[PDB]
Structure formats: structure tokens, C-alpha cells
Design a protein around this ligand. Structure first.
Ligand SMILES: [Mg+2]
Ligand SMILES: [Zn+2]
Lengths: 191, 160, 200, 52
RNA sequence: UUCAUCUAGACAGCCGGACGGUGGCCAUGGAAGUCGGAAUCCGCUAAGGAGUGUGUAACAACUCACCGGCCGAAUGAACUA
């Protein structure tokens, strides 16, 4: 229908600087710097007052104005990842076999090694996406936490960990074994 | 501990030798001989033979204490005053015989104490709804007709 | 039918305004229908409890302020789940009748805990395996033959601090009931000048 | 045996789902249409059958 | 296109309540809103169906229609090609 003008507001907190060349966004915060290529989207960024960015689509279609809000959400994710960070907590669910999950080094590659899933003798290996920190949480039984600035990398690595531990040839409703994201939140509490 | 007190409200056909195969499953675990409960139920609901009435059973010190719950619907049925029905064979007993306003109003008086209805008119409206469920007619009028009339004031229910 | 219904509500609200001289703004949050049922039963004849959608109430109140301008102070107080307990009777006894119902739930998950949790040293009796809550929250205790026994008094949460899921469920199985639920009058309109309920 | 908390967590991903009639696709539990084009994005959906 | 909702606060979202007469009546051995038939009331009400689904031997315990809390501007359905 080609809306004349659609606009979204991106709020920039105090401790972050956003430098936006054409569609390459560089967001700097206390926890680090993230960069994103958004040249595939055809939007216009404009600073208002150094605490507000407006991202606009002019004469865009329905899909175009949908992708405008997608871009706004992605930049918001970048800003919250450099301010608060992202943490995905996964619990291990197992009926009989405890799932042996640890961190191993192979040529300096930081792989999450999984053994004994359904009793399998296969060794499942999940590479750690760069920037993602892994910590095994004490005071919670069988919980691994993946943290980082970028929600894309954190959630993607959690998703690979979840997908590599899918059950085959079994009623997945009964054989509920796996590694499942039990929480998705931010590293700094209640900000 | 025998001092344990436990309330056992159960709606049951009155005044008859009730289903042991229904009452024992509950009292049994509590250490309670079925027979004694059966005498208590039958005697307490004697008046309500052929009238399914709720009866509470207090339990303490491995004994029973029957008290026939004055359930609005069963009180309505007793107001209809049907001599003991052959429920065994007289299935589908359409107990909708007429009742003068007297008994319904008195039942509403009986039930007001627990009921939240701010007026005896309202409590009568409640009991008339129970009679609607029964099918019971009130003085050749649908109990909804009586309820609407009471709301209008024409059937002035005395407040006490 | 919203026009006629809201107009009727406005009219009845006015009538309550004129006849009833004073009012009880009440925080009816987490009050069961049954709970309000006994509370209103107690308040029968004594006072009355009217309920409206805050925005509807506020629109009516502006409209009624048009002639009775003593209610701009009432305007902010119509916020959240709050009931107007209209009253032509002594506010002290009205406040008592409101306060009475405090049906306590054990650590209702999520809701803002209104009490300073002191988990007294008590034989829990609850099953061993469920220690998870205790262990996660520290809460020094002793697992004696399955039946854990709280060794010392622990303030897992307090008043005004939303119960975290863990401690909420912990006191849920521990059967300590801090979440006394009952309509809590926030403010009380007094014949031209609202005052905070606290005094009554 | 899996404790009920973890069992609910696992069912959230394995069983709290929907199934397309035409293409048997596993869909989100509250989905209105299938995400596969091969079925024409049909709205003929059912709940995935619960265990026992 | 037609029909509706909306600053007297719309839809969605999240959170609160979701009762009492009454296990309504008749049946079943058991059926208490939720295997069946018929009755859909009344009160307390901001509000709740003699019940929308999960569920139980029946219970219970959950969930929803209904009304509430937050935000504050448009929104929902069935159709047409
Ligand atoms: Mg097989
Ligand atoms: Zn499909």
C-alpha cells in the first residue's frame, strides 16, 4: 500500500555510543563493541538528540515496513547486549543416563563435548561461537550458562547444543532427554 | 490421633439402607465400621426416604455424628411432600407437584443465614430457582414468574 | 449497550456520593470473589462496597466534580485494582471490618510479598529430595533421616520485595503462609478531605 | 524418571506443539497456519497427541 | 463488502478474581459444571455458564467464557475477487 513514512525509535542509554555508517551499525557499551551489517534492508537512520535514533522507511511496502521493525529490534538487541549482556541457561534433562557435558580444547577450538546421551558411545561436539562464555552453574544441578554481548551468537550456540542432542528412532514424547534452554535473560540482574 | 475431627458432607437418598458400596470407600480408610454409619444415615434421613438429601458426618475418635444437611433442593422436595418413592423401579419420577408459597418462603428463611442475599425476597428467589431446577411449580406459576413478581413487590415476602 | 450501562453506573455512583458521606479507597488486589463475599456480608447495612473500572470511575468523578469540586484529591487515588467502599458510618469500625479478612496463602509466586519473612527453626517434615530450594538459597538446615529441620531463622525475602520463584515455591511447600490476602484500604475519604487509611 | 520441572521444560519443546494435517509438520503450539509452502500454508492444524 | 468494538479506554499481551444456593433435576454401580436427557434460574455482584476445555472411580486439582489491573489508538469477524 506504500505507506508514505514509517518510523521507529531506538533509545540510546548513557554509556553507549552508536556510530552508523551507511547500514553498518557499531554499538559501543560497557561490555564491548558489536557491529552489524544491515545493507540488505534499505532503511534510513537518523540521530535526533544523541540519546534517540529514528529508523525510517519511506514509501515502503508491507514487507518493507515489517523489516523496519525487525531492524529496530536488532539494534535494540545490540544495545542491550553491550549494556546488560545476554545469558541463556540450559538444563540437562535425562531419564536414566546423566549427560556428561564439559569444555574441551581441540587445537584451541573450545568445543563443548557431550557423552553418554541416551547411553550413546558417540562423542557429540559443539563449537563455541566466538564471544560466547560458558560457565557451569553451581547450586543448580546440571545447568550450563552461555553468556555474551550478542544474542545471535549466544542463542545460536545454545540452539546448536540443543539440536545436537535430539533423540532418534524413539518416541520423543517419552524419551525427553536433551539439553534445553530453561532461561533466557540478561547478565546483569533486573536492569 | 482419635481427636481428629473430619467433616463428611455427602448427598445421599434419605431414610433408606444406603449403598454400602458407596459409603464404605470413604469411611473405611478413616477406621469406621460401615454398618454404624448406615444406621446413622438411615435414621437421620428417615423423614427424607426417597428424598436425596445431603447429610454431613462429623468423625472423631473412630465414631460418626450424622446431621442431615438442610439442602435447599431436598427441603424443596420435602415441601412437595411425596411419600417414600419406589425409586428402585419408579425411575424418572417427575417430582414437580405444586407448593404454596408458604413452604418455599420458610425454606428460604432456613437458608438465609448462610446465603448472602440481602433480602428474604432474594433468598426466596434463590429457593425458587432451586424449584425451577426441580421443575416444581409454585401456586400454578413458574418459579421464575414468582421471582419476577417478588421483584415487582406483588408477592411481598415478609422480611422476617 | 455500553452507553446505557455506563450511564447507569455513573448515576448509581452519584447516588452513593450524596447519601454516603465518606469513602474507603481499598486495594482489593488478590481478593477472591468469596473473600469479598464475606467482607460485603459483614459490611451489609453498615457500609457498601462499589466496584468500577478505574477509567470509568475517573470519568464519572470528573463529571461529578463538575458540581462537587472536592474530589481532585480522589482523582489520583483511583489507580489499580481499588474499590470504593462508601460509608455513612464511623470510619474506625469500617476500617476494622475491612481489615478482618486476611486469608493467608503460602508465598504466592511472583506477587509482591507484603511481610518480612522470618523462617523460624522448625522440623519441615517434607520429603528429603526437595532440599533443592534450601540448597540453592543457602538457608542452613540439617537433613536428619529425610525429614529436614530448619536450624536457624532465615529472611529469604521481605515485605515489598517480589518473591523470587525459588523462595516462593520454597515457602509454598514449607506451608508458611505470609501472603495474607484481604482488601487493604489504601486511602479513606473523610467528609471533604481524604486521609491515608493508616490512622484508622 | 525425570523430575516434573525438567519434564515440563522438555515437553515445552517436544510435546507442547501442533501438527499440520496435510503435511504432518511440527508447528508451534499456538500457530494458526503451517509454515511449509508444500501444504499451501494450511490452517488445518491439530494438537500433537499427548503421551498416555 | 457487510457487521461489530473503541478515550465512558478497543484487540493482543502480561497479572487478579472467576463465587454461593447447588453434589441443581432425572437417571448410572460411580457422574459433584465437564459419560447421557431435559431444565439454564436466582442471589452476592466490577464478575463469573447449573459451564469452555484438561482431568478424577466419583472427588479433587487446573483452564476458559465473564469482569477486573497495566499500556493508551485504533481494532476484530465473516465474506468478495
Ligand atoms: Mg521403536
Ligand atoms: Zn502444513
Amino acid at each position: 500500500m506504500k505507506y508514505i513514512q514509517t518510523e521507529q525509535q531506538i533509545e540510546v542509554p548513557e554509556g553507549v555510543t552508536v556510530s552508523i555508517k551507511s547500514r553498518i551499525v557499531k554499538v559501543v557499551g560497557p561490555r564491548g563493541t558489536l557491529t552489524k551489517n544491515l545493507k540488505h534492508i534499505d532503511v534510513t537512520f537518523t540521530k535526533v538528540n544523541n540519546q534517540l535514533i529514528k529508523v525510517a522507511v519511506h514509501n515502503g511496502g508491507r514487507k518493507h515496513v515489517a523489516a523496519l521493525r525487525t531492524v529496530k529490534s536488532l539494534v535494540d538487541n545490540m544495545i542491550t547486549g553491550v549494556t546488560k549482556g545476554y545469558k541463556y541457561k540450559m538444563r540437562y534433562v535425562y531419564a536414566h543416563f546423566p549427560i556428561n557435558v564439559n569444555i574441551v580444547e581441540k587445537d584451541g577450538a573450545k568445543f563443548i563435548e557431550v557423552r553418554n546421551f541416551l547411553g550413546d558411545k558417540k562423542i557429540r561436539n559443539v563449537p563455541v561461537r566466538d564471544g560466547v562464555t560458558i560457565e557451569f552453574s553451581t547450586n543448580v544441578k546440571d545447568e550450563i550458562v552461555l553468556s555474551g554481548n550478542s544474542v545471535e551468537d549466544v542463542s545460536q550456540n545454545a540452539a546448536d547444543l540443543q539440536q545436537i542432542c535430539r533423540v532418534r528412532n524413539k518416541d520423543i514424547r517419552k524419551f525427553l532427554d536433551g539439553i534445553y534452554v530453561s532461561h533466557k535473560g540478561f547478565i546483569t540482574e533486573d536492569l | 490421633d482419635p481427636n481428629e475431627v473430619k467433616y463428611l458432607y455427602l448427598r445421599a437418598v434419605g431414610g433408606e439402607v444406603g449403598a454400602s458400596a458407596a459409603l464404605a470407600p470413604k469411611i473405611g480408610p478413616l477406621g469406621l465400621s460401615p454398618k454404624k454409619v448406615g444406621e446413622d444415615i438411615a435414621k437421620a434421613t428417615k423423614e427424607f426416604k426417597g428424598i436425596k438429601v445431603t447429610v454431613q458426618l462429623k468423625i472423631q475418635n473412630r465414631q460418626a455424628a450424622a446431621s442431615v444437611v438442610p439442602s435447599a433442593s431436598s427441603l424443596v422436595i420435602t415441601a412437595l411432600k411425596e411419600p417414600p418413592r419406589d425409586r428402585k423401579k419408579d425411575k424418572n419420577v417427575k417430582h414437580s407437584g405444586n407448593i404454596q408459597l408458604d413452604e418455599i418462603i420458610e425454606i428460604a428463611r432456613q437458608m438465609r443465614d448462610k446465603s448472602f442475599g440481602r433480602t428474604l425476597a432474594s433468598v426466596t428467589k434463590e429457593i425458587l430457582g432451586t424449584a425451577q431446577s426441580v421443575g416444581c411449580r409454585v401456586d400454578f406459576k413458574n418459579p421464575h414468574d414468582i421471582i419476577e413478581g417478588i421483584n415487582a413487590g406483588e408477592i411481598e415476602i415478609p422480611e422476617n | 449497550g455500553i452507553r446505557e450501562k455506563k450511564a447507569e453506573y455513573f448515576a448509581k455512583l452519584r447516588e452513593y456520593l450524596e447519601e454516603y458521606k465518606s469513602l474507603f479507597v481499598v486495594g482489593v488486589d488478590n481478593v477472591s470473589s468469596q473473600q469479598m463475599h464475606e467482607v460485603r456480608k459483614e459490611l451489609r447495612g453498615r457500609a457498601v462496597v462499589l466496584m468500577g473500572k478505574n477509567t470509568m470511575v475517573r470519568r464519572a468523578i470528573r463529571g461529578f466534580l463538575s458540581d462537587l469540586p472536592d474530589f481532585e484529591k480522589l482523582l489520583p487515588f483511583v489507580k489499580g485494582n481499588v474499590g470504593f467502599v462508601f460509608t455513612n458510618e464511623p470510619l474506625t469500625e469500617i476500617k476494622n471490618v475491612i481489615v478482618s479478612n486476611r486469608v493467608a496463602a503460602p508465598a504466592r509466586a511472583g506477587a509482591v510479598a507484603p511481610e518480612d519473612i522470618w523462617v523460624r527453626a522448625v522440623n519441615t517434615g517434607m520429603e528429603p529430595g526437595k532440599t533443592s530450594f534450601f540448597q540453592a538459597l543457602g538457608v542452613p538446615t540439617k537433613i536428619a533421616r529425610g525429614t529436614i529441620e530448619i536450624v536457624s531463622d532465615v529472611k529469604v525475602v521481605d515485605a515489598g520485595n517480589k518473591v523470587g520463584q525459588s523462595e516462593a515455591s520454597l515457602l509454598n511447600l514449607l506451608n508458611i503462609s505470609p501472603f495474607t490476602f484481604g482488601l487493604t484500604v489504601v486511602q479513606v475519604y473523610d467528609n471533604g478531605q481524604v486521609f491515608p487509611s493508616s490512622i484508622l | 524418571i525425570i523430575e516434573p520441572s525438567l519434564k515440563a521444560l522438555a515437553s515445552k519443546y517436544n510435546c507442547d506443539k501442533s501438527v499440520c494435517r496435510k503435511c504432518y509438520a511440527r508447528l508451534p503450539p499456538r500457530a494458526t497456519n503451517c509454515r511449509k509452502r508444500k501444504c499451501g500454508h494450511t490452517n488445518q492444524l491439530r494438537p500433537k497427541k499427548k503421551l498416555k
